[PDB]
Amino acid sequence: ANFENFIGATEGFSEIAYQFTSHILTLGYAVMLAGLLYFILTIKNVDKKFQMSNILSAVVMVSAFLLLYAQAQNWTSSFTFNEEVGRYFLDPSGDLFNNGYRYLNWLIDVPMLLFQILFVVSLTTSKFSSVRNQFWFSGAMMIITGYIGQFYEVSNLTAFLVWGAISSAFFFHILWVMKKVINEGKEGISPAGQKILSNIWILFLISWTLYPGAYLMPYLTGVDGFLYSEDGVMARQLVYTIADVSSKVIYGVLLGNLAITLSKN
Numbered sequence: 001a002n003f004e005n006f007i008g009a010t011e012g013f014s015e016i017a018y019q020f021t022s023h024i025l026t027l028g029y030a031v032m033l034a035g036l037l038y039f040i041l042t043i044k045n046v047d048k049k050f051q052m053s054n055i056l057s058a059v060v061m062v063s064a065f066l067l068l069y070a071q072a073q074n075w076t077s078s079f080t081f082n083e084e085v086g087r088y089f090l091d092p093s094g095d096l097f098n099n100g101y102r103y104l105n106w107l108i109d110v111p112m113l114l115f116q117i118l119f120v121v122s123l124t125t126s127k128f129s130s131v132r133n134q135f136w137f138s139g140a141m142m143i144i145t146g147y148i149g150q151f152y153e154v155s156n157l158t159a160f161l162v163w164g165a166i167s168s169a170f171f172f173h174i175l176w177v178m179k180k181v182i183n184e185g186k187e188g189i190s191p192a193g194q195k196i197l198s199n200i201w202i203l204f205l206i207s208w209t210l211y212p213g214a215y216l217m218p219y220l221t222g223v224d225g226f227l228y229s230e231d232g233v234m235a236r237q238l239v240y241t242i243a244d245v246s247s248k249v250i251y252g253v254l255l256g257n258l259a260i261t262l263s264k265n
């Protein structure tokens with residue numbers, strides 16, 4: 001299937017690479033449930049006119065909690081310990097590790113996370129429906145073509161790469177359109193609100209860029225380097241979790257802070 005199952009069935013996993021990976025993944029959906037409560041409880045702190053952004057964050061948490069829980073359970077019960085060798089190996093009587101849960105979660109979250117900014121800042125010369133369509137199209141295509149390259153990950157590396165680059169073309173359009181959005185949104189508002197906007201732009205840039213870095217991770221030290229191992233498995237799964245907390249939770253907190261800042265007058 002994937003590089004994970006390859007390692008789980010060629011070399012297997014050490015006790016620590018298995019446990020660590022399960023612990024970080026558990027932490028991942030535990031944070032989503034925490035955020036879900038944060039965004040519901042604080043929805044009263046923002047004016048009626050920005051609340052849609054709290055609403056969109058609440059829903060992202062519901063799906064992120066739900067699907068990252070599935071993934072977590074999917075990693076723990078796909079490998080079983082072998083007393084003879086002392087590692088964890090892919091269990092042929094299980095379901096095999098499946099990263100589909102996480103791609104499904106992106107296909108849902110991406111439109112919302114992109115849509116919700118447009119309820120906090122105001123455009124100037126760009127049209128709302130124009131920006132929204134461009135966000136929804138390129139973001140959908142970024143995930144679909146990423147999913148397709150994800151199949152060739154362990155077999156045909158070249159297709160894994162050509163498809164990853166296509167998905168990168170859509171990624172950069174989004175980065176261009178969000179650039180234009182944050183600029184127009186800075187026009188008018190107070191200097192404090194521009195400060196928050198700039199933070200949001202810095203965070204949006206890093207947090208989304210971690211994702212292709214975790215897509216490629218087991219190849220960044222070569223077709224037989226240090227990461228082509230349970231360590232790249234470990235590391236790709238740590239970067240995703242860092243990325244999920246950044247692009248889903250912290251992003252939405254900053255938008256709420258921005259909404260609040262924009263009610264001073």
Ligand SMILES: *C\C=C(C)/C=C/C=C(C)/C=C/C1=C(C)CCCC1(C)C
Binds near residue numbers: 168209
């Ligand atoms: C959970 C929320 C979000 C916004 C997830 C975003 C995921 C990405 C930006 C993924 C991007 C990819 C790219 C650009 C190319 C390689 C394949 C990926 C799907 C990892």
